[PDB]
Amino acid sequence: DLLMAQTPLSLPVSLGDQASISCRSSQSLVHSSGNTYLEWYLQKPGQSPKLLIYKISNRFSGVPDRFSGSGSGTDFTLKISRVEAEDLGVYYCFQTSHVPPTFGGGTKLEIKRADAAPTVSIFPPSSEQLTSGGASVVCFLNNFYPKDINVKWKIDGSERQNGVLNSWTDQDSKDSTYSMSSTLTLTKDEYERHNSYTCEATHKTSTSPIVKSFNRNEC
Amino acid sequence: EVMLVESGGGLVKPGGSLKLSCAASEFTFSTYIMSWVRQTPEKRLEWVATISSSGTYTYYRDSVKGRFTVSRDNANNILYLQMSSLRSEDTALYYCARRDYYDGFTYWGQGTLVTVSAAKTTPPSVYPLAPGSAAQTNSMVTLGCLVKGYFPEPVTVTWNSGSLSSGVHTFPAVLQSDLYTLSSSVTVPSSTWPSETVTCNVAHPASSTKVDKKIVPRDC
Ligand SMILES: O=C(O)CCCC(=O)OC[C@@H](NC(=O)C(Cl)Cl)[C@H](OP(=O)(O)Cc1ccc(NC(=O)C(F)(F)F)cc1)c1ccc([N+](=O)[O-])cc1
């Protein structure tokens, strides 16, 4: 029934610039009291959510004065005025003017830093994993920006799309980069029928793929 | 500081019951409205339940009504959430929060994980990830640990018992076929490996396992 819609899903912003986040409810958040119980929470990577703003615009104790809240009726905005690295995470609006209390779906604040290309490392299956009858081929792509990246695997030249799972860390507050793992999971038997394994990373930082490769028979 | 510590989350079969608890300290617990809020595996936040300071009034999200009961022990400063007829939608991290009336969820615990599934608890297999022969870069070597085939979440990964912190990335687990897998990477100077040991320590509290995998050069 009552929806809390946030835009955008993701918001890149430079340190020092102002970020603005919107929360639009489907009905008026004016409670029967005449007050409006719209709150804003931030979730830092690996942390619990924490309160920023209550009653539209009031800051919780200890919240930096750079965070501010505004709006009325159905439209609310959280502004962060001179963004710092530690401000990254997911920001959620929340309403308790009308049962049932409801959160927004969240907006990621992303720190916009200089483009950085990934450092790519490839890893054959370990001897012990093979000893157990499985085979995962692992590629790490570390310390890159922006987040968007496509990883192609090739096995003896045949592009391979099935068996490949990609996982990303949250953005690192220390350097504003992302890292990702791309894992190709095969049966030992399939793995042992092929010799050349390659993970290829296409990122806007280069025209050419960053390719890391091994031959099953080398080392 | 005000503190809130959840207990009791873990793996429960569909249709089952579990009761979470939350120990409160450093504030007058019995003065305050208290709440449970959950975060789904996809990171959506859902309010679950609220209980008034005295316990007289209780409130629930529609999807949990009749199945969950929020309660509190004001003598011993504990908030509870009894859960029954558990379903897969109920899989989430459960936070207890202090609710300062209309001034917000001011304090939150770290959360306790609940997993509703028919699958069996399975400890991880931990596999080393060491570089090829010669292609070990040779000034900065990246190593890793593949943590494969465990259930339920979570696992804790450290390197050299936490001593090795810098240059570490531990990737979120992905669930497939009722088993989770994750990897962790660490980059270290050549002077430090393999001539000094690098070990990934992997803890899986659900199976009470704790495994320390040393990364050693490939036999080549
Ligand atoms: O309970 C009474 O006193 C009689 C009922 C009407 C009343 O005067 O109080 C309504 C008020 N309830 C209470 O204060 C009880 Cl906790 Cl004693 C109210 O209840 P209602 O307006 O009847 C329905 C309602 C239910 C849940 C919430 N919000 C939450 O539970 C929140 F998500 F915010 F935590 C808000 C309103 C309300 C206000 C604030 C909060 N809260 O969590 O901060 C909860 C409840």
mmCIF file of N, CA and C and ligand atoms in Angstrom, chain A residues 31-32 37 39 41 94-103, chain B residues 33-37 47-54 56-60 99-105, ligand 1:
data_model
loop_
_atom_site.group_PDB
_atom_site.id
_atom_site.type_symbol
_atom_site.label_atom_id
_atom_site.label_comp_id
_atom_site.label_asym_id
_atom_site.label_seq_id
_atom_site.Cartn_x
_atom_site.Cartn_y
_atom_site.Cartn_z
ATOM 1 N N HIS A 31 1.145 12.886 10.093
ATOM 2 C CA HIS A 31 0.463 12.080 11.104
ATOM 3 C C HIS A 31 -0.758 12.831 11.689
ATOM 4 N N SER A 32 -1.587 12.121 12.428
ATOM 5 C CA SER A 32 -2.833 12.633 12.997
ATOM 6 C C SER A 32 -2.543 13.815 13.952
ATOM 7 N N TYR A 37 6.652 12.075 10.665
ATOM 8 C CA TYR A 37 7.630 11.197 11.286
ATOM 9 C C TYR A 37 8.394 10.456 10.174
ATOM 10 N N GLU A 39 12.179 9.749 8.904
ATOM 11 C CA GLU A 39 13.532 9.578 9.423
ATOM 12 C C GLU A 39 14.509 9.113 8.320
ATOM 13 N N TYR A 41 18.381 7.112 7.802
ATOM 14 C CA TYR A 41 19.363 6.208 8.429
ATOM 15 C C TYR A 41 20.495 5.986 7.408
ATOM 16 N N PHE A 94 12.695 6.402 6.170
ATOM 17 C CA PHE A 94 11.831 5.567 6.912
ATOM 18 C C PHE A 94 10.678 6.398 7.394
ATOM 19 N N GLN A 95 9.478 5.831 7.378
ATOM 20 C CA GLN A 95 8.298 6.579 7.930
ATOM 21 C C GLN A 95 7.534 5.839 8.977
ATOM 22 N N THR A 96 7.146 6.540 10.052
ATOM 23 C CA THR A 96 6.255 5.925 11.018
ATOM 24 C C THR A 96 5.044 6.791 11.357
ATOM 25 N N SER A 97 4.653 7.639 10.407
ATOM 26 C CA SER A 97 3.460 8.423 10.513
ATOM 27 C C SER A 97 2.186 7.527 10.364
ATOM 28 N N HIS A 98 2.316 6.462 9.581
ATOM 29 C CA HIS A 98 1.177 5.591 9.203
ATOM 30 C C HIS A 98 1.564 4.125 9.227
ATOM 31 N N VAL A 99 0.818 3.384 10.023
ATOM 32 C CA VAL A 99 0.985 1.963 10.113
ATOM 33 C C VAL A 99 0.740 1.369 8.736
ATOM 34 N N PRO A 100 1.581 0.419 8.272
ATOM 35 C CA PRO A 100 2.795 -0.108 8.898
ATOM 36 C C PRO A 100 4.023 0.752 8.596
ATOM 37 N N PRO A 101 4.884 0.914 9.585
ATOM 38 C CA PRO A 101 6.152 1.620 9.338
ATOM 39 C C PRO A 101 6.940 0.978 8.204
ATOM 40 N N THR A 102 7.523 1.801 7.366
ATOM 41 C CA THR A 102 8.114 1.386 6.106
ATOM 42 C C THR A 102 9.375 2.139 5.827
ATOM 43 N N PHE A 103 10.400 1.396 5.364
ATOM 44 C CA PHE A 103 11.640 1.933 4.819
ATOM 45 C C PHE A 103 11.568 2.120 3.343
ATOM 46 N N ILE B 33 10.488 2.225 24.621
ATOM 47 C CA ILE B 33 9.933 1.447 23.558
ATOM 48 C C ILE B 33 11.081 0.701 22.903
ATOM 49 N N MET B 34 10.854 -0.538 22.532
ATOM 50 C CA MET B 34 11.918 -1.325 21.851
ATOM 51 C C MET B 34 11.402 -1.949 20.573
ATOM 52 N N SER B 35 12.301 -2.182 19.590
ATOM 53 C CA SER B 35 11.901 -2.662 18.258
ATOM 54 C C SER B 35 12.829 -3.736 17.727
ATOM 55 N N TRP B 36 12.281 -4.555 16.850
ATOM 56 C CA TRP B 36 13.077 -5.476 16.014
ATOM 57 C C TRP B 36 12.978 -5.021 14.581
ATOM 58 N N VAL B 37 14.124 -4.986 13.906
ATOM 59 C CA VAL B 37 14.167 -4.608 12.479
ATOM 60 C C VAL B 37 15.035 -5.594 11.777
ATOM 61 N N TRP B 47 10.829 -3.321 9.038
ATOM 62 C CA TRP B 47 10.448 -3.232 10.466
ATOM 63 C C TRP B 47 9.699 -4.518 10.715
ATOM 64 N N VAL B 48 9.954 -5.165 11.855
ATOM 65 C CA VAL B 48 9.289 -6.425 12.214
ATOM 66 C C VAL B 48 8.257 -6.238 13.333
ATOM 67 N N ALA B 49 8.675 -5.621 14.444
ATOM 68 C CA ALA B 49 7.837 -5.532 15.620
ATOM 69 C C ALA B 49 8.299 -4.470 16.575
ATOM 70 N N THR B 50 7.347 -3.960 17.374
ATOM 71 C CA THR B 50 7.628 -3.018 18.403
ATOM 72 C C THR B 50 6.816 -3.350 19.659
ATOM 73 N N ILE B 51 7.407 -3.088 20.821
ATOM 74 C CA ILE B 51 6.806 -3.303 22.111
ATOM 75 C C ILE B 51 6.962 -2.025 22.961
ATOM 76 N N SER B 52 5.892 -1.613 23.646
ATOM 77 C CA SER B 52 5.916 -0.465 24.486
ATOM 78 C C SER B 52 6.773 -0.686 25.698
ATOM 79 N N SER B 53 7.094 0.416 26.376
ATOM 80 C CA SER B 53 8.047 0.323 27.501
ATOM 81 C C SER B 53 7.641 -0.768 28.517
ATOM 82 N N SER B 54 6.356 -0.833 28.865
ATOM 83 C CA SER B 54 5.838 -1.753 29.882
ATOM 84 C C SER B 54 5.481 -3.141 29.334
ATOM 85 N N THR B 56 2.737 -3.656 27.445
ATOM 86 C CA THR B 56 1.319 -3.703 27.234
ATOM 87 C C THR B 56 0.913 -3.648 25.787
ATOM 88 N N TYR B 57 1.622 -2.866 24.981
ATOM 89 C CA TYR B 57 1.222 -2.759 23.599
ATOM 90 C C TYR B 57 2.306 -3.339 22.698
ATOM 91 N N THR B 58 1.882 -4.026 21.645
ATOM 92 C CA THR B 58 2.804 -4.629 20.706
ATOM 93 C C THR B 58 2.218 -4.432 19.319
ATOM 94 N N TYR B 59 3.115 -4.352 18.351
ATOM 95 C CA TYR B 59 2.817 -4.004 16.988
ATOM 96 C C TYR B 59 3.699 -4.845 16.087
ATOM 97 N N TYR B 60 3.167 -5.256 14.936
ATOM 98 C CA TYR B 60 3.836 -6.181 14.016
ATOM 99 C C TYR B 60 3.670 -5.821 12.565
ATOM 100 N N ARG B 99 13.929 2.524 20.510
ATOM 101 C CA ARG B 99 13.064 3.450 19.822
ATOM 102 C C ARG B 99 12.667 4.591 20.721
ATOM 103 N N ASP B 100 13.210 5.789 20.466
ATOM 104 C CA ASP B 100 12.947 6.941 21.343
ATOM 105 C C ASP B 100 11.644 7.615 20.941
ATOM 106 N N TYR B 101 10.563 6.847 20.962
ATOM 107 C CA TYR B 101 9.262 7.341 20.548
ATOM 108 C C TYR B 101 9.357 7.875 19.140
ATOM 109 N N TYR B 102 9.017 9.134 18.911
ATOM 110 C CA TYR B 102 9.062 9.638 17.539
ATOM 111 C C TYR B 102 10.387 10.292 17.168
ATOM 112 N N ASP B 103 11.418 10.079 17.981
ATOM 113 C CA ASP B 103 12.728 10.616 17.719
ATOM 114 C C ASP B 103 13.684 9.529 17.221
ATOM 115 N N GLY B 104 13.155 8.365 16.817
ATOM 116 C CA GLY B 104 13.878 7.442 15.921
ATOM 117 C C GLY B 104 14.458 6.195 16.555
ATOM 118 N N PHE B 105 15.058 5.344 15.684
ATOM 119 C CA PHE B 105 15.718 4.159 16.165
ATOM 120 C C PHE B 105 17.131 4.662 16.526
HETATM 121 O O1 LIG C 1 -1.135 2.650 23.498
HETATM 122 C C1 LIG C 1 -1.819 3.619 23.916
HETATM 123 O O2 LIG C 1 -1.420 4.519 24.702
HETATM 124 C C2 LIG C 1 -3.257 3.707 23.421
HETATM 125 C C3 LIG C 1 -3.220 3.625 21.879
HETATM 126 C C4 LIG C 1 -3.216 5.038 21.271
HETATM 127 C C5 LIG C 1 -2.054 5.892 21.917
HETATM 128 O O3 LIG C 1 -2.314 6.886 22.603
HETATM 129 O O4 LIG C 1 -0.750 5.478 21.706
HETATM 130 C C6 LIG C 1 -0.535 5.113 20.350
HETATM 131 C C7 LIG C 1 0.994 4.984 20.271
HETATM 132 N N1 LIG C 1 1.412 3.873 21.129
HETATM 133 C C8 LIG C 1 2.240 3.989 22.159
HETATM 134 O O5 LIG C 1 2.790 5.033 22.527
HETATM 135 C C9 LIG C 1 2.561 2.648 22.826
HETATM 136 CL CL1 LIG C 1 4.291 2.206 22.337
HETATM 137 CL CL2 LIG C 1 2.358 2.757 24.538
HETATM 138 C C10 LIG C 1 1.438 4.508 18.978
HETATM 139 O O6 LIG C 1 0.619 3.569 18.405
HETATM 140 P P1 LIG C 1 -0.337 3.674 17.137
HETATM 141 O O7 LIG C 1 -0.409 5.024 16.615
HETATM 142 O O8 LIG C 1 -1.557 3.106 17.761
HETATM 143 C C11 LIG C 1 0.236 2.500 15.941
HETATM 144 C C12 LIG C 1 1.678 2.547 15.684
HETATM 145 C C13 LIG C 1 2.452 1.361 15.660
HETATM 146 C C14 LIG C 1 3.846 1.374 15.396
HETATM 147 C C15 LIG C 1 4.514 2.563 15.190
HETATM 148 N N2 LIG C 1 5.882 2.694 14.885
HETATM 149 C C16 LIG C 1 6.804 1.814 15.280
HETATM 150 O O9 LIG C 1 6.539 0.751 15.848
HETATM 151 C C17 LIG C 1 8.263 2.160 14.826
HETATM 152 F F1 LIG C 1 8.479 1.522 13.660
HETATM 153 F F2 LIG C 1 8.383 3.458 14.629
HETATM 154 F F3 LIG C 1 9.135 1.703 15.687
HETATM 155 C C18 LIG C 1 3.757 3.732 15.187
HETATM 156 C C19 LIG C 1 2.391 3.732 15.454
HETATM 157 C C20 LIG C 1 2.848 4.460 18.744
HETATM 158 C C21 LIG C 1 3.689 5.588 18.789
HETATM 159 C C22 LIG C 1 5.100 5.404 18.643
HETATM 160 C C23 LIG C 1 5.641 4.120 18.454
HETATM 161 N N3 LIG C 1 7.027 3.979 18.268
HETATM 162 O O10 LIG C 1 7.502 2.778 18.006
HETATM 163 O O11 LIG C 1 7.773 4.980 18.392
HETATM 164 C C24 LIG C 1 4.813 3.007 18.422
HETATM 165 C C25 LIG C 1 3.429 3.186 18.605
#
